[PDB]
Symmetry: C3
Subunit: 240 residues, 3 copies
């Protein structure tokens, strides 16, 4: 691979590894809002989802780094077949988002995201013009899923803001809004990147697409999980 | 493919898509027995299983439609490898059946169905005479699973009928019996179709086998889910 | 295959099949500590995990037996790709271990074991020297997971021993300690077997590695599940 590609892969792998190790340490050392439960997150494993996500992401990028130094394909599921790592991760991200917010249809939303990602995987491994049909079907399903998840997220954000008066509550709400903006705005770029890649309109080269994918992953995973975590720890739920 | 095959694929895809969209609309608009919960199914995601099943089925058939118009294989998992779509769907159907009935060993029954379907997948990709051994092992496992699930279903049906006196309760019980008959009688045809296909006794041609599979899927998914849904909404549980 | 390989495969398959059928019969006939619940394990499906594990293991070995009598590869997922059967089974074993002990991070520990096994699968299908890097990463992850799971297991064993005074309680504690020793000591042999196989230091031939793998599987599944089961049935929890 090119110098830029290998450098971006190494930087992304190191960033996600550091983020995974910090998140795991914070989760293990977290003692709950009361500061008395030794294994608060042990009996509430959903709070660990973020951590696992990062770990998986890190592993994927690790494979990429190996593929960056060898002429032969590395771990095919995480390097060869596109969007499989996303198939594994994004549903967990949606489940965590709708769990911290106590939103309805968390499992349904996660399954919809997984189905959209599998449709995208089929589209990326298809041949035109059938690839166009697969992309159109995925686009309709993702539009429906996006509208549904926004409607739930907006209604939970309004509910949370209605009963948030403490300064710490306001700071946690700002972090939650930042995480929500990262989740919604950034996710819309992935379809734009696919439609702008060598597939369909070929304008952006492979290297720039890969670097943009790496940057979007790093942001929307590391910063997203950190913000979610700031919000979960520093937002009193009993204010409901 | 032949005109009959493509016509059957299109009809099945349209029927399952319409069934998925109607079931999703009904589930989203359903407000619970009391008619006061805005997200009754949101906090009870098992009631959405049916919907997801149909959606997945629809997607599978969509792939078939694409494979029906191209000389190259489409989405291999849903078109090339047989029974993989069934591997994904049937365990969910069993889980939903044993959940609406509040039956024991729902997860165990789903795992048994998944194991039987994986054994069938191995059998379909094997070479004789090892295919015969795989089929025999799958037949013993499926016989055990069928006897166990019938025994649970019959005992829950007797329990439900013991305390069902309302006219609406009787109508819901009739729909539940129709769904149970569809689940049990129709499922016995799939092994008969496999034993009658080009594998083992080659009497029925590929096209007729495909059309019969499409009809059985459409019935035992669309009508089955509609009946289950009639039963879940229009059967007061508090009569226990 | 050689006479020794086929004999070991047949013996392992028969042992695991007999163990699965005895465990399933005991679980179905078990009526709970009170001896009044007809479906005690039906509403507590975690107690069935062991059974399912054995069944899956049995199926895997069945495939091996077929591969032992044909020049062509059998069910590739359970015979060709190494550690995939382990990917399916070991996480369930860890989940069951941490569930019977009411240990924290049971799902987290299961996901860590699954990630370690997937890393091992990637390592076994890699090419040197990238295989060495994959093995090193898997070794660090497994060391962390081993230390974490030991720390949880030791703390739950101390907790259980603190309030175990009955003779039957002592007998169940002895069986639990035997199961824990099987889980910890035996698992350390698998990495030693991999490091001693044709990969890395080639000293032990393939046949001896296969026989050792079969013996370790048989012990650490059949005897492990039987001990876990002796402990779950014959240990009064109300003594907490
Ligand atoms: C239990 C299953 C655990 C996953 C096993 C994956 C094995 C992949 C394989 O053999 O590839 C062969 C081939 C490619 O082999 P190849 O020879 O082209 O390289 O891979 C596939 O066909 C795709 C496999 C997808 C498997 C399921 C999705 C990924 C799940 C784990 C990802 C990591 C999560 C963290
Ligand atoms: C696919 C469907 C899988 C079966 C789900 C059945 C419904 C579970 C349910 O109601 O759980 C309630 C409760 C939710 O908590 P609670 O609020 O009911 O308590 O379930 C759980 O606590 C655990 C469920 C986790 C399931 C995660 C699934 C992720 C989906 C991503 C795509 C995977 C593709 C394969
Ligand atoms: C996380 C994993 C998500 C599923 C990824 C599937 C990738 C399939 C693939 O790469 O095929 C390569 C090859 C065939 O490639 P080919 O080149 O022959 O076409 O497929 C397989 O080897 C079989 C893959 C089975 C994967 C698991 C079961 C299906 C799960 C999703 C089905 C849809 C549910 C709705
Ligand atoms: C394979 C085993 C997976 C782990 C299951 C562990 C037991 C879960 C349990 O007790 O759940 C209780 C409760 C059941 O509800 P409840 O009645 O306990 O409340 O679990 C849930 O609410 C969610 C569990 C959903 C799991 C669905 C598994 C489907 C299996 C199909 C085959 C998949 C192959 C891969
Ligand atoms: C829903 C998915 C259910 C599992 C389907 C497995 C299909 C495997 C396949 O097509 O292999 C093709 C190819 C090999 O084909 P081949 O032609 O080399 O033989 O297999 C793979 O690429 C690996 C498949 C891994 C799939 C996921 C892990 C195993 C899950 C089930 C194991 C049994 C549990 C008990
Ligand atoms: C991968 C993550 C999957 C989603 C898990 C989300 C958290 C679930 C949770 O909190 O459950 C609580 C409760 C635990 O019981 P309880 O003590 O909360 O009641 O969950 C259940 O009862 C059922 C969960 C079973 C999930 C089994 C996962 C096994 C992981 C092995 C690797 C699989 C790779 C694919
Ligand atoms: C950490 C990585 C994440 C959250 C990746 C998310 C990716 C998507 C939401 C992708 C969506 C796509 C479509 C809606 C259309 C088809 C192309 C995709 C896969 C880019
Ligand atoms: C919606 C589709 C469904 C419910 C399909 C179900 C299929 C089966 C129950 C198939 C069973 C089989 C056997 C018991 C023996 C081996 C051959 C099979 C796969 C047809
Ligand atoms: C029933 C079979 C079981 C429990 C198998 C367990 C296997 C392991 C814990 C294997 C671990 C390995 C490593 C930690 C390093 C890489 C090589 C492995 C897969 C042998």
């Amino acid at each position: 691979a090119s110098s830029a590609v290998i450098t971006a892969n190494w930087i992304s792998f190191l960033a996600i590894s550091a983020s995974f190790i910090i998140l795991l340490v914070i989760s293990l050392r977290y003692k709950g809002p009361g500061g008395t439960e030794s294994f608060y997150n042990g009996f509430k494993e959903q709070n660990m989802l973020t951590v696992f996500i990062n770990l998986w992401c890190a592993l994927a990028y690790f494979a990429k780094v190996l593929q960056s130094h060898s002429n032969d394909n590395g771990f095919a599921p995480l390097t060869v077949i596109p969007y499989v790592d996303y198939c594994t991760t994004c549903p967990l991200l949606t489940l965590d988002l709708l769990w911290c917010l106590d939103a309805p249809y968390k499992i349904s939303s996660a399954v919809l995201v997984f189905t959209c990602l599998v449709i995208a995987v089929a589209c990326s491994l298809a041949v035109a013009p059938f690839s166009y049909c697969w992309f159109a079907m995925g686009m309709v399903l993702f539009t429906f899923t996006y509208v549904f998840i926004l409607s739930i997220v907006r209604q939970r954000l309004d509910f949370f803001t209605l009963c948030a008066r403490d300064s710490n509550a306001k700071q946690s709400l700002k972090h939650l809004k930042t995480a929500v903006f990262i989740y919604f705005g950034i996710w819309l770029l992935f379809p734009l990147l696919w439609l702008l890649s060598y597939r369909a309109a070929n304008v952006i080269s492979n290297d720039i697409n890969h670097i943009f994918h790496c940057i979007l992953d790093v942001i929307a995973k590391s910063v997203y999980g950190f913000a979610l975590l700031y919000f979960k720890m520093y937002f009193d739920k009993k204010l409901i």
